[PDB]
Structure formats: structure tokens, C-alpha cells
Amino acid sequence: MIQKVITVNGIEQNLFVDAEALLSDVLRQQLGLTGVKVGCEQGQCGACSVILDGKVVRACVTKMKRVADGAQITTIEGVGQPENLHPLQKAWVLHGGAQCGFCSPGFIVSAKGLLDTNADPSREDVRDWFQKHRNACRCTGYKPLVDAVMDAAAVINGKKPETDLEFKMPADGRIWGSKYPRPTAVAKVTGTLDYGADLGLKMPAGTLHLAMVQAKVSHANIKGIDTSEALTMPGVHSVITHKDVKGKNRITGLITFPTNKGDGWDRPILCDEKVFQYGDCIALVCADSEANARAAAEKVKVDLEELPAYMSGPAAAAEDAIEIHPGTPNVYFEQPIVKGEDTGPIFASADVTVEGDFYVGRQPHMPIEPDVAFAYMGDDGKCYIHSKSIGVHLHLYMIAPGVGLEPDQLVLVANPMGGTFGYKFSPTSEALVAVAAMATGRPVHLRYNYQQQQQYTGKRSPWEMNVKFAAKKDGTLLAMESDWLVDHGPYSEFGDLLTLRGAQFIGAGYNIPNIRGLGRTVATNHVWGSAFRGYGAPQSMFASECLMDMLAEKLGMDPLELRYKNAYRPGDTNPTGQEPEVFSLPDMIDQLRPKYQAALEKAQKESTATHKKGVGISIGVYGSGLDGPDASEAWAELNADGTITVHTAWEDHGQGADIGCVGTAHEALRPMGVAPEKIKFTWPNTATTPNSGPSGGSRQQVMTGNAIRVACENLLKACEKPGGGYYTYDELKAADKPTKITGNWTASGATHCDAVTGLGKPFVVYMYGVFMAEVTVDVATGQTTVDGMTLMADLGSLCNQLATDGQIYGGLAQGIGLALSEDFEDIKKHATLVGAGFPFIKQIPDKLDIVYVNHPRPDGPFGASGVGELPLTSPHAAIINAIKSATGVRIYRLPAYPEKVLEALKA
Amino acid sequence: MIQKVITVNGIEQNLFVDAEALLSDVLRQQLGLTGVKVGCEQGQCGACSVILDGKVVRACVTKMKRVADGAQITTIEGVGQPENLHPLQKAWVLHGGAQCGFCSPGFIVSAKGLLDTNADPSREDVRDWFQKHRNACRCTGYKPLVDAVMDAAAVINGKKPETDLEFKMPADGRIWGSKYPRPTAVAKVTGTLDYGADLGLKMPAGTLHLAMVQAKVSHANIKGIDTSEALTMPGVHSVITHKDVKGKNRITGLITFPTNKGDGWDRPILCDEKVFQYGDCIALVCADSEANARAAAEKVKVDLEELPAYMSGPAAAAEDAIEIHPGTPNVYFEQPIVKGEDTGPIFASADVTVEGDFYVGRQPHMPIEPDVAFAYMGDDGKCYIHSKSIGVHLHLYMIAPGVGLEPDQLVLVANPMGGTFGYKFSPTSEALVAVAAMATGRPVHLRYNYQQQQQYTGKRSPWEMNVKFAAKKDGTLLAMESDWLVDHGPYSEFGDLLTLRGAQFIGAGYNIPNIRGLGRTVATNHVWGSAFRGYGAPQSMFASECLMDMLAEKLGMDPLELRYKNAYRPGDTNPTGQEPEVFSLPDMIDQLRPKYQAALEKAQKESTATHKKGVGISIGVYGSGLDGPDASEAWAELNADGTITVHTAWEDHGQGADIGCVGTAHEALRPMGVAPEKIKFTWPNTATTPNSGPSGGSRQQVMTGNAIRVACENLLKACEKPGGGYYTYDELKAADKPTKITGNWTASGATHCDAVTGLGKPFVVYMYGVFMAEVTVDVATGQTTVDGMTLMADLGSLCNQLATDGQIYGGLAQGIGLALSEDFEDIKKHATLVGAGFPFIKQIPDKLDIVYVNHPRPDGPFGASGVGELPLTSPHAAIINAIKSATGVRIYRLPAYPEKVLEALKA
């Protein structure tokens, strides 16, 4: 051990450390500076950036031996605090740079380092700095972060007053549609919002820390578990196995379709008889620290009989493949789509037909914060779980029978969280922590490392797809045929539903009167399927939007004009036979047209012999809602202090549940003149917030936004004075009148799609958009650079523009990843950010352009649709269409790795 | 466990706690708010004061169940931080209210609570508030704390500008003699100085926490130790016993006098054969936390044969008493005092003689911070100990042979510390932590609780005393006889030396030509003797100063005039035959006289039938230095940045080692124009600071102050340019000239007192003072209230007036405790602050008056003497003399408990 006397955030610290210890651990654990965020732990994400003697370093890869006596360290806590914000922190707030907020401390500390060395950077200088310092963000698409740096620099340079970093209320006093900052932004930019791992450090002494004993083969029969050596190891309390589970030890898919051949109870909580994928949790070590639990977990011995594993859909779907879940065929679900007339004769007599085989793979979510959860037994006898769940009520019912609790005896709460992008539509760690809390009676905390986040959370499910179009010479679509195979890994939850998305979204955007198709879901031993932003659209619309370009090529027609000819107009129906609710695609195409033509001309002029430029188009469509007559609930409560609490379970991945609530309520409460800072939101909790439903399906703004609107309308009625005006809280309480008022809303016009035909009216509100990608391909290396993305977006009406702009930039960046670099195919190689192709700042163009073409929705609150998933519906199709434009090469199977592109160029 | 969402220092905290947990533990351990200081842990000291929903509460006695959802908590960290100080914190700094600083956060938080309820308090309102809230201070005497509250309130009230709370540099630029604030004050008032227990919380995961297995009888032969149950208990690593000690397992007294009958190696590190006092450490449990170590320590079984214990000096000194240390008589040392002619004939022929038997007991130090230390093996192979040692070099040599290390292999460092008042002139926990670090190879931390601080640290040693005077009718002293018996408990360290103090200080202040006396030291089984501020003078001068009043009474002379007649004047010698170095007592008496006469008149006028007022006088004298030719060393270093570091081992109990260094160096460096903020001090460290010696004997200002002066003079010579002016660092470095320059100083004129006669010249500088106490006795109850204290003090020249004023107020308050309420006699009853008679604010008058009558010392730096122990030399004699003045009752045996006073009143 060594004494080190240093200065941290301006205060002399008399430190006692192990010279081998990581600075991140010292700062977080010994000094309580949990504003230093840790994600990857491998020096790849910059979340743990700190200033050390004037240099920006990653604290997770800086040992204490590199910190000299007398060193100066700055963390986010030293940059500024609430009520003493630095210009960078004010700028972040103003520009909406904190979505999940997990990367915000590291970017801000890194930026301070930049500005201390270059007071007046160009935008390009800012991008070069964040690239060099590995500052990664999965939410924002980087552009808002650069905007914030530039604004702060101008203030620091005396070129503009600091007061201009503070939001100015619009003239009308309306925050709906404005850039009003989100309530959680100050806490995020100051490092004072506690995420799950931060909460773990601030839990009491009694708390047990868990480590997973995980399968290191993809498929096996389990013969036994020997814990004897682990029990003798430092700090070890106990080891938990399936024997300690008090219920069924299975997670239920809950809404398993009746035509599914499996019962939906296939997923274990702790493996008993079998390993179904690499990483499966077989046991939990409980110890005094994460480090001691992990060390002991390595000594637990599992006796296994390894079985042949099926690592892709086609492999597992073979007619003679062995049943992974004995008694259920590996192909466990099929969804037909049967619209209009038989397609065979129409294809035979059509002027033109095209066909393609496409593949979209196992995209990894890659939030900067790896999964984390904790649980405890309350003094009320109930089991409490605090996790990254974005469907607290959903998950309660998915896990309660398995853990052995009635629903009233379990409470699920959503912690502040550093992004999910859908992986938390699935249970991950909730049942594990519940089982351990119940078995030990003690508080328990489980943190995944980044390898476990990659290997042992669910993934976008690969789809192998064949799609065909028949059309007239003038471009009018006549018919479509479709076939898709969905590799869902071993656990069925929502796999059938994902497969149904193919019937709804393959070919969406166009009038197609005649469709015949079939989706099939298959169990495999690769990673189980969890929702990933877009949930079947990124697969479906990659195929159809690439195929539209192929059809345009075969017709000798411009691909934007082919889309114009076919885009939904009054009278048309979507693939499930439903009329669209608004008709904005022609408007969006007309507004994009001159920009597209100019981009074509620029690409022609600026192309060189070695660097070929191209422009690509696609349409995107997705529903806002869960299928059928989805619903939500909110309570609007006038508090004694005159503030209003809007109680919901709107789960915040980081997308903006806080600002969605405040902005929607503010608009609904305007008759009573309620200031936005007086409106409070509630963190999701199954005991004390209503069942607003999950934050999946780009649904909350529509469903919970409407419920909030109705609750607030009902509160206004409750407060109305006869003669005009409004009663105060004290007046209502004196009259023994209610102050907490419910609102509900249901998407009553919706129906579930039919099991035989696929037809129905699954959503009452959709999102619509048109993408344009501008790319350069180096034809010597095959490397593609995306130079610009544009999204024409119809969101109906914006609740908050900082929220929507950011959602779109984030989704476009994930689209660039999906197109060019991202997969989870190789269990080890793809288990790091860099290995799996995470997009760092230089991979995302600074030119991300949005054009809102909003057509107010009949059923949306104040006319709003959702936004969340719109920007990832088909940006990757636009990008691949642009590669084709540039070079003549079509990539059919994502991603467009350089070698793959080169092989196609040279064929 | 329960979730609690509350606000702490203005920030929302999502807390997870045990409802039974103490708020102090939650704030310190879970939230890292170590500005919440914990001392007593029993709700008696206020150090852990926090604001909870507008009320000031003691966090160590507030369970989390009393903290409601939505509660607001403020700690010192929420009051203000460095560079954002609250007016209370600025005022504390300006008024010198932080000495050790341990109580400062709690007083400041408590004061904020006061001012939030009463914006314009009277001084009396402030005293009532701190009494009610149990805010205890052992350093300051409370008056500076009240001054600070009043000044802050005026600013908060807009009656004066906040800038007036900031120190204004004197016209001359001289900080010597000024009220310049101490360098450590900002850290103390903000809770950002880490004391030993705070450092323990910020140590790494690997650190083992220790608990003592202690004797629960006063005297025994040990037969065995059974650790088997303790080893099976939660979190337990190992148990350490004498078998694990690698050296002699004895602490050496090091300077044991040759005429001592014992070898000075009597004290074990871990008991082997015997228990010698209640509390002796027999074993150490090493565990993952203090709580787990303590639980397991209760299960360690010690097999003992209890022996009859001698619990007082007279008991152990009986001719037939059994030897506690077999082979050494219990009375192990005698010091004669033989000055001038045989006293018997002079007593026989004298006009008047008086005699008395007096007792001063086992006063407990009662710092607000209980003992704490830690140790580790450095990467350099050396053992490091960080503790409350106020003699790091001394303790290194006292413990190295016992722990089994050569001196170069052990390093002792003084942590910031919350007061000692002498108990840390002894080793307490240093050898214990060293043994455990060496045995385990791991860092170890040991915190005593307040019961252990009381029972198992050393104490003022009781003295049973008989003193006699012979005098002429005119009051001229002719002769003195003296006999004293010193109960030193079982461990000999510095016991012989303490006994020698009796020869030096009984009767000090007066010319007494003929003295015959004898001091004897006896081992007992009550608590071992450690220095307590005054170190033999409080005993010695209680006897002589009470006896002077008895002599005045028998002569019918005023007691101030009897002192005037006899006080040292040129030609006189002190008891050891040495001429005083200055003669300030007549000056001080003349200046006090009218104040004394006025106080007598006020007491006559304001006395009632039931409440009798009195006035009492005493003189105090003590040396500044260790005996003989004491010495110190300092290094003055010009740093590259133009600052100057003055390297010393001046140990800071809280008295002001920092400001002593800065002020002394500033004065010495004035020719070169060095600003005070450019002068740095060093925390004591045996490897990297010179052997400046211990902070005992009121010696550092003289000895180390002189060494600092000489070092700085030598640095000026090193920096001098030919032609005039001074070279800069860069100029000296370019010329390959030295920048780190040594200075030494030795008290060359001093000699050790003789073993046969007691005569010698032990100190070259003394401190001199005259006390006046004003008291009221309730003759129905026997309760004495001290209404005023005055000290005329000759300190030569003041280094810093905030430091000296505070030292005097602190010592006067300890004098009130010693006189009226304090003892450690009953092992259990006296093991709490309240039980042992700690003086809370109402016990200390707001009227504490100082008058400096400074006569510059020939050998002091810039003429300075020490101050530390002067104010505790005899204030308790003045107080008892005042009780006599009021009521006619003399208390001979301290303390003057009410029942004792009543029995005397009614006799």
C-alpha cells in the first residue's frame, strides 16, 4: 500500500491505495465519486474520463502507480454541481445532450480538457478530440454533443453571454413543441443521478454481491454442480442454484400465441437440466464484494454433457434437426400473410418481376451501461427488485410464478438507466436477484460486465428473407411474395410476435393489393431474441426497401419516383388490409426531391476514380403501440404545495419519459396556468404507479400521453370553480373533495392480426418517414463512409423537439452501425464494443438533417405519434442503396464489411 | 431494507437502508459524508449534528426509521465548501474556533439551525442552544465559538458586510503577533480534513478492521486464549495474540532514570503472562469491518486467574504489598529535593507554619475524537503507522524493539487529530496495528470507541501530597517541606520524570531558600499514567497554591499581597536552585490588583444568604522544553514555484503546529518579503521530516520555533545576492546552488536535575501566570458555578494571538473540570463524557479574560515562550481558593463535587 497526497476537484486528499488499483475504483469506491461512470471497463467508451495533470485519461485503465504525489485530478463533480453549473453543463442541458445521461459526465470532462488546450475548436476539432479520447454515445448520434461544446466555447471565450445558455420561455408560454430541457438533465450532467451500479456502492454493509456461474458451451445436458471450493473462498456467503428457487424456475412468455407449438414456459431462471446457450446462468455466488464473488464463481465446477449446437436459423430448422426443447419442434411458430388474390398468376402475367434473398443479423444493443439490478426483502414482507426493466408490470407477471411469489408480494422498480434500445423488454437479471434475495433474506446486487452484457443479454433476431415484387411497366406494384425465418435463440418470449411484424412491415409504405407470404420462428442455441429498436422493421424493411431499388433499376426508373408512384394515398391499404390514418409520404417525397437531385449532382461531381459517391433512398413505417386495443393509465394529483404530480409507469430508457410527461401534462393543464417546473413525474414502481405499460413499440407518447392528457383534463374538472376559475388545494381539502384524479385511454379502434391471414388493424397510429443517405466508398479497400443522413419525419406534433431531434439522430447512428459494422456472431470476438463494430464519432456524419412534415394524428394526444423506432426502420437500406448508387454493388447480407464490399467490387 | 427518497445537502438521494441503521453510519459510510464527525457515539458530544427537517439532531442516535420519505438533511458539506464558505464558516476561521477542528462541523451545523430559528441571538441564547444540543468542545473553552456565531449573525442580518469576515493584513505586513488564521482552518470548518476514522472509511477493500479482546478484570495471571468460536464468525480473517509478535513484545520507556528500580521494559504490546489493568489488550480480531471484528472479539475466551488488585497508590505502596511486576518493588522510584539548609530547625523557630494534605486525581483527557490508528506494509518493505502520535520519532524508538523492526524499517506519521491533551505522549494503538500489519501483510485499521478511550488510554496520575511552609510574620517564606506519592498505574513510561516535576514545581513562583522533600512513584493496577497537559504542575501547584492561601489566612494577610511579597525577583532562585530568566510576576500582580479588589467588592455586594460569592487567586509556572539541553531541527526549502516549505515534525494535537510554523517562518523570512500564503508546513513523518521532537512540555514554539528561525536565516543567506537582493529558485538552480537548507537549535544552558538533590537548570524558558477565579456556591446544594476566570500571562511575545487566546481559554475550561467535576476512578461510571464530568458550555463562563504581560525571553524565538500548559498549571487552585473565599470551606481532595462541598459546609 502507498500513501498518495494529491488534489481531487480542488481539495487535497490524503489517499491510501494499492499501486495496482484502478483509478476508477479508487475514485468511485474509496472517494464516493460516482459521477465517474464505468461501462466497458476496457478503455473503449470514455465514460470514466477524468482530467489527470491536464490530460484526459480513462480512469478504468489508469493504475494508481501512474498518479504522482501532488497530481491534480478533476471529475464531473469538480467541473460543476447543481446550482453551480459549468458552461459545458449548461450547454449540455440546453442542447439535450443527456438522453440516458450515462456518457454525459465523461464527455463533459473530456470537453473541458479539449477547451483547456484549444479554446476555439472547429466542429471537426471537437469530433477529432472525442474520437481520440474514445468518448462513446449510443443515444444521441453525437451531433447534439458537438453543438453543446461549440456553444460553451463561445461563452467561455466571451463571444456570447452565459445567460444565453439558459432556456428562454416561448412568448406563448407553451412548452409543448418547444426545446424545454428535460427535468433529469441537471442530475445527469453533474453525475448526481444514481444508476444501478452507483446504487450498489451506496447500499449498506449487509448487502451481498452476486456473480454468475455461466455455461461456457452453447448446448448441454447438466449432470451436476460442485460448489465446494467456491464456499471456502474469501468473502463467500453461499452459492444459489435451481434447488433454491421457490417457484416454477421458469419465465413465462405470458402472451404466447395459441398457434405457437410451444407453451412459452421454456426459459429457466437457473438452468436445471440443460444449457441452451453460451452464458446461461447455472448458479449465483453471494459474497461480500463483486470482486470476491467473481473470483469464487470461477471455482464452481459444472459437470456437463455437451450436445451439438445449432448456431443459425437454417441449421436448427432442418427437417431432421434434434429438438432443443424436447417435445417442441425447433420451428415453433408460423405466421401467414394472405391479402387479396393469389399471387402466382399475377407474377406470371406481370410486365416486370424482381426477387431477392436478404439477411439482417444479430445486432447487439450496446448501451454504454452494462446490465445491473438489485433486490431485497422489504420490512413489509414483499420482495423488491430495482433494475433496468422498461416494463415493470410486464416483468412482474413474467417472473412471479417462476420465483414463487404471488403478484402482490413482488414489487418491480425501474432504476435510472444508461440505455437499453429494447434489450430490457426482456427480463435479464430480475429473477436472478429475486431468487437470491428470497433465499438469503439479505439485500443482493448483481452487476454484469461488458462481456456478459454482450454474451448474456438478448439480441436482435437474425432474419433470412426472400421477397418478390410484381409490377406494371409504369411502376405500379401488383403483388408481393415473402418468406422469412426468424432465429430467436432458445427462449421464446415475444418470438411469435416478432415474426408477425414481418407480415405487417415487409413492403410497408405502398399500396400492394395482393400478398402471399409466410414467417417462421425457430429456436436455436445462439443468443435469445430480445426486442431491438424497430423490432422486426429493420429486417422487414431492409428487404423490401432494397427490393424497391432493384425494381426501379429493372424498370429504368428513378427510385424516389418509383416510391412516389406507389406511396400510400387515400383509398389504399397497408399489408394487413388497414387504411393508413394519415397520408404524408407523397408530401415528404415532394419536399425531399430537390435535395435528392442536388445530392445526386454533388455525388457525380465529387466522385473520383478511387472514391465513389452515391445517394440512396428508403421509406420507413412502424406502429406506435402494442398490437390491438392497447391502453394506459395516469393519475394527476394536486399536492398541498400547489405542485402537480403526474403518476405513471412511463419507463425511461433515456428517451425522455420525464419530458414526455411534463410536456404532455403542461399542454393539458394550460387552462389552469400550471408552470412546467411545478409538474412532477414518477419513477416506475408496480406498487405505487399505474399500469401504463412498457416502453416498447414506440407507444408511450401515444398511449400514456393520452392517459396523462385525460387525467389532467379530469383534474381540471375536479378543480373548476362554479362561476369560472379554479379552486386551490386548501379549498378542495376544506370541502373534502378529491385531489388525486385518474385518467385512462384505450386505442379502441385496433384489432389483432388474424392467425390465418395476418389481416387486421393492429395500431391506430403509425410513424412515417423517408431517408436519404450520402456515402463514399473507397473502391481499393471496400470501406464506406457515411457523409450525410436525412430523415423526413411525420411525427404528428412534437411534444419536445430536443427529445425528438435526439431520438432521430440516435436511431440514424444505429442505422449506420447496422449497415456497415455491427453484429454479434462470434461469441468472444464480438463481446467488446470495438470488436462488435460500435460506431465511434467519426463513423457518424456531422450532417444529420431532419425535416418534420407533421400530419396530426386523429388518435394521438394533440396529434402526436411516437418517434422512438422510426429512425431505425430502414436507414440501413438507404445506406446500402447508396453503396449501390456509388459502385454498382448490392450487399444483400448485412453488415457491409469492407472485405465483403471488395469481393463484390472485384467479382 | 427500505427505499427512502430524501434530499441531502440540496440533492435528491435514492437511499437504500436498514430502518434500524444509524443516520451517522448511513451518511458517513453509504454517502461518503465524512464531514459528519463521530466521537462519543452516545448522543453526548454533538460532533455528529445534522439538520433534519429544520431540527438539529445527533445523527449517531437517529435511526433511519425516523427519517421520513421527502426529508431534508443538511450536513457540513451542505453548509459550505472551500471557496464557497458560509458566513458561519468564515467567522469560525476569523475567530480561531477550529483548534483540533473535530467539533467544528457539528457546532457550525448546530449554529445554522440556531440562526434559522433565531436570527439575532444574544450570547446567552447561543450558550443555551449549544447546551441543549450537547455541542462539546475540549480545545477552545467555547468563547471563540460564541464570538464566531455572533459575528456571522450580524452579517446574515445585513448589519455588517460579509467582507469583514475575511482577515485584513496588518499595515506592517507582519503576521507574527497577529490574528492571521491557521492554514488548516478552511479544511476543518468544511469537514474536508480527514481524521483517522475518516481515513479508515476511505481505505481500500483489502483493509482489515481490528477489534481488541480486552481484560475485564484489573489484575490476573493469563492461562490461555481460545479463539475457536471467533474464527467461525462472519467476516473474520484471523486472531492475533502475543505469539504473533516478532520482537520483544514490550514497549520501552527509553529514558528510564538510572535510579528507577525497574528496567522500563514492563509494558507488553499484547499481554502474555499477565493482565496489569482493566482493558489490557490480550488479542486482536482482524475482520472485514469494525462491526464484524467487534462481534467476534466478544466470543474470544480468555482463561484467567484473577489476582488481588491495588487500585490506589497508598494501597500498592504498603510495605507488605505484592509486587505487580515480580522482581521490582511497587515503589520503583524516588526523587529527593534538597535545597539550602535543613528545614526542621527553621520550622521550629519560625513565626508561622502551615501544613496540608492534598489530592489531585486521575483526570481523563476526553478529546472529542477517540483513539484511532492504522498501519500497512509499504511497497518499499517498511511498516507504516499513521496515528495520533504527538512524538513520532519518540514512539518509533519506544516500539521498534517490541514489534521486531530496526528503526529504518518502521515509519510513523501523525494523522490530523481531534485533540489529545497529552495522552498521545504515550503509545496507545501504534504497536497493536504494527503487529497486525506485519502478521497479516494487509492494511489494518483500529478505532477505539469512547469507552475504550476512557478505560484504555493513559490518565493524569493521581498524587497524594503533604506540603508545609515556614514563614516570618511579614509573610517572607523561609522553608518548605514536601512529600508526594504518584500512582502511575502499571506501566512505567515517564513516571519517574513526572515524579521529578514535583521537585521542580511544588512551591514554584516564590523565593524559597530551604527545601526538603521526597517524591515517590508507585505501580498500581489502575489506569497507567500518560502525560496530561501540565504534567505534574496541576498536582504540585494545587498543593502549593492552596497552601499559600492557608498561610495568608493564618497571617491575617491578603493572599494576593502574600504572593506579591514572595514572587520571584532578581537574585531569587526557583526550587531547583536556578535563577528565573525573566521576572514578570510582580508586574502581573500589580496589574491584576485593582481587578481583584473590584471582584472582591462585587462578591460582597452580590452574595445572598443562599448563594455565596468568592474570589480566588493562584500563580502558575511551567517549563517550555524537555529537561536539559533539548533541541530541534527544521529544513527551509525554496520550491520551484517560489513557495517555501518549512519541513518539521511539529506534531499538531490541534494547538496550532501549522500556524506556529507559518508565523515563525514568516517573521524570520521578512527580509526576503515572503507572503504567508507561500509558506508550507509538513505533517510529521519519521522518514521525511527531521527529528523536531514531541509536542510535549509546551516546547515546540521555543525549540522548533528556534530551529525554524535558524533554518530560515540560513535560507536567506543561501539566497542572498552579492550587491543586495535575493536570487530566485531558477537562478540558484542554474548555478547548481542548494535550495533546501537545514537549521538546528539547542537549549545549551540547560542541565538535568540531580538524582540526589533535585537541583539543576532543567529549562531555559518558563511560562509565568497569575489566575483569578470568581465563583458562586449554592450553600443548600454545594454546587459551584464559575462566573469568571482571568489569566495574567507572560508568553514573551505572541506568534499568533488566535492560537494563544484559544490555548488559554481551553486550559482554563479544563481547570474548571479538574476543580469541580472530572475524574476517572470508577471504571464503568466514568467511561462516558457525562459520567466523568466533561464540562459542557454552561459550566464554562463566557467571561474568560486574558491580560498579556509579555517579557521577551532571552532564548525564545523573537522572545517567545510556550503557552500550551500554562493555563492548566493552577486554575483549579484559584477556583478552590475562591470556594474558600465564598464559604469558609476548603476542599483538599479534588474534585469539589456538590455532596463533598455540602458535607464540609455542614460539618
Ligand code: FES
Ligand atoms: S473507457 Fe473506462 S469504462 Fe469504458
Ligand code: FES
Ligand atoms: S446519452 Fe450518451 S450513451 Fe446515453
Ligand code: FES
Ligand atoms: S453525539 Fe453523536 S458522536 Fe457524540
Ligand code: FES
Ligand atoms: S476544536 Fe473543539 S474539540 Fe477541538
Ligand SMILES: [Cl-]
Ligand atoms: Cl451480400
Ligand SMILES: [Cl-]
Ligand atoms: Cl473486413
Ligand SMILES: [Cl-]
Ligand atoms: Cl476534601
Ligand SMILES: [Cl-]
Ligand atoms: Cl455530588
Ligand SMILES: [Mg+2]
Ligand atoms: Mg461559472
Ligand SMILES: [Mg+2]
Ligand atoms: Mg412445458
Ligand SMILES: [Mg+2]
Ligand atoms: Mg390506385
Ligand SMILES: [Mg+2]
Ligand atoms: Mg454565501
Ligand SMILES: [Mg+2]
Ligand atoms: Mg525486565
Ligand SMILES: [Mg+2]
Ligand atoms: Mg530577598
